[PDB]
Design a protein around this ligand. Structure first.
Ligand SMILES: *C(=N)[C@H](C[C@@H]1CCNC1=O)NC(=O)[C@@H]1Cc2ccccc2CN1C(=O)[C@@H](NC(=O)C(F)(F)F)C(C)(C)C
Ligand SMILES: *C(=N)[C@H](C[C@@H]1CCNC1=O)NC(=O)[C@@H]1Cc2ccccc2CN1C(=O)[C@@H](NC(=O)C(F)(F)F)C(C)(C)C
Ligand SMILES: [K+]
Ligand SMILES: [K+]
Lengths: 306, 306
């Protein structure tokens, strides 16, 4: 029993973290085979942050201008190139701890683990979601850029995020591992800000099912609703629309508990219209939307990774 | 910016997890040098759970009756012995990924990371606290026993918990790595239940400081209090007494923010007497007590591990 915000084991990713230094700036890079991937803004200086001309800054740097360290060992850079908002530093040594891996671009509403790193060394791991507004609610300080997010399936690490920027509310923006930003954001010090976020409805439902599996059932009512009527209430409270694909994705949790998704929706509608009145669900006084259905099943069935 | 329930990188511990099978039961063990440590109840059967006679069950088992698997490779057991509530299985191979490590018995109020495992393979990592009532609010299913909790300092893994039991409210009980239970609990299927818990006050204060560092300041009032007056309010709301040692442990966070601990206490007293009135602190509608001062400083300063 119990339910925690659970991260993936980080070991496969830890063996890939290195330090990249270019002049003043040090941040983190990801060493896979003989390539280190890092944020291109490692080549910037404090002045040229308003509008960096990345091609112009880069043509002034040669291989030796990138200092790349894997713990105590220096990795010699023998090539470099820019792809979108990342640098690929070809090094003379293939990483012997490269895991089986894929680069994936995740969808809003999906979750992943972040291995927060400073100077190439890991600080901690936590779980996050790609918000509908293409930000993530992370925990990141100066020097954290190049830290990655990832999922593990079986034996394969799927890298989906690299950290670049912090936006005004203290939320975070970054790229996939091809260097394309999630959302409208760019690596410039400008006025950009996050769009208005929404609450990931299918995930809230998943978490209500998680509550039920753990014996926390007080919020279940005797009513049902239609999908259309549910979605009218959801819009009012700034919840995403629930689609039939969402309903079907929730099928396994509905089956385990014997609670039809639309019945669960009627209970969610009541929680949104009436509040929780001092009560908690899985130790929380708010509805939680950063567990996906798959996350709930993994945790409540004991799924492991090779 | 930002603040998350952050776990330690798990890689050093992942390389120590193995599977132990004895007849019907499979659970997890911790492979350090040429010793595998696991819960002694691996030698039990479904009937003899009310009152196992562990010495009698064990004398009927020889080395070959313990099947120990490190991923795909079988580890031959060449000795076995019982220490308190754990078995130590001497194996013919020293683990080549043994990290620098220590066995520590933590204090109530302290936090650690759990690497939840099934069949020797990791499922996820999350952060927990040793509750004042010597339980932990974990997430554990059948087969999770032998999963460990730990802290990382510099390059040294300090193992502090191994998982054995689930108590009636869905909370968890286990031992240190010498096989002594935390709390009054034992490895028997009996009526045992957890004492009444309390809220870890110094930790709540640490987390309020974490809020302030991140710009979430609305709960700070203009008042102060004495330590004795604060502790009268704390008792009423089932909070532990705050000691002068606690006050001094909070010194670094008080210094960074410029908020005297007793001033912060006056703000906490107001939150306990008046509630939050629909507001949140660091995204939470409840006060959080599973961050220690040290956890807050690590996260808000970027501490890394070798
Ligand atoms: C990575 N090391 C660091 C991570 C930030 C630091 C504080 N918390 C974080 O998460 N990245 C930056 O500081 C980036 C780098 C950069 C590249 C090109 C142009 C400008 C910058 C400045 N950075 C910012 O994150 C800034 N944010 C923004 O400019 C915006 F809000 F996104 F527009 C700022 C946090 C104001 C330094
Ligand atoms: C470890 N594999 C497993 C972890 C439990 C299973 C469900 N969730 C968990 O965290 N451990 C057990 O099930 C133990 C083992 C044991 C050893 C000796 C005697 C009896 C048992 C039965 N176990 C329990 O956890 C049981 N709890 C209690 O008996 C008590 F509440 F602590 F008294 C029970 C959860 C009822 C199976
Ligand atoms: K240009
Ligand atoms: K005995």
């Amino acid at each position: 029993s119990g339910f925690r915000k659970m991260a993936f084991p980080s070991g496969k990713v830890e063996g890939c973290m290195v330090q990249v230094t270019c002049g003043t700036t040090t941040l983190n890079g990801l060493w896979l085979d003989d390539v280190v991937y890092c944020p291109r803004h490692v080549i910037c200086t404090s002045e040229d942050m308003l509008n960096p001309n990345y091609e112009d800054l880069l043509i002034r740097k040669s291989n030796h201008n990138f200092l790349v360290q894997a713990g105590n060992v220096q990795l010699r850079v023998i090539g470099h190139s820019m792809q979108n908002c990342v640098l690929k530093l070809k090094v003379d040594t293939a990483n012997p701890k490269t895991p089986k891996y894929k680069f994936v671009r995740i969808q809003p509403g999906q979750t992943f683990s972040v291995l927060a790193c400073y100077n190439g060394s890991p600080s901690g791991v936590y779980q996050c979601a790609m918000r509908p507004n293409f930000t993530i609610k992370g925990s990141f300080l100066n020097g954290s850029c190049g830290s990655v997010g990832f999922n593990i399936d079986y034996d394969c690490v799927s890298f989906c995020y690299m950290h670049h920027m912090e936006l005004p509310t203290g939320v975070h923006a970054g790229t996939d591992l091809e260097g394309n930003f999630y959302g409208p954001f760019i690596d410039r010090q400008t006025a950009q800000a996050a769009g208005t976020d929404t609450t990931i409805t299918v995930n809230v439902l998943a978490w209500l099912y998680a509550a039920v599996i753990n014996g926390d059932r007080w919020f279940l009512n005797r009513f049902t609703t239609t999908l259309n009527d549910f979605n009218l209430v959801a819009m009012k409270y700034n919840y995403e629309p629930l689609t039939q694909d969402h309903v079907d994705i929730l099928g396994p949790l509905s089956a385990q508990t014997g609670i039809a998704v639309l019945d669960m929706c009627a209970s969610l509608k009541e929680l949104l219209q009436n509040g929780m009145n001092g009560r908690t669900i899985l130790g929380s006084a708010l509805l939680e939307d950063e567990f996906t259905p798959f996350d709930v099943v993994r945790q409540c069935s004991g799924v492991t990774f090779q």
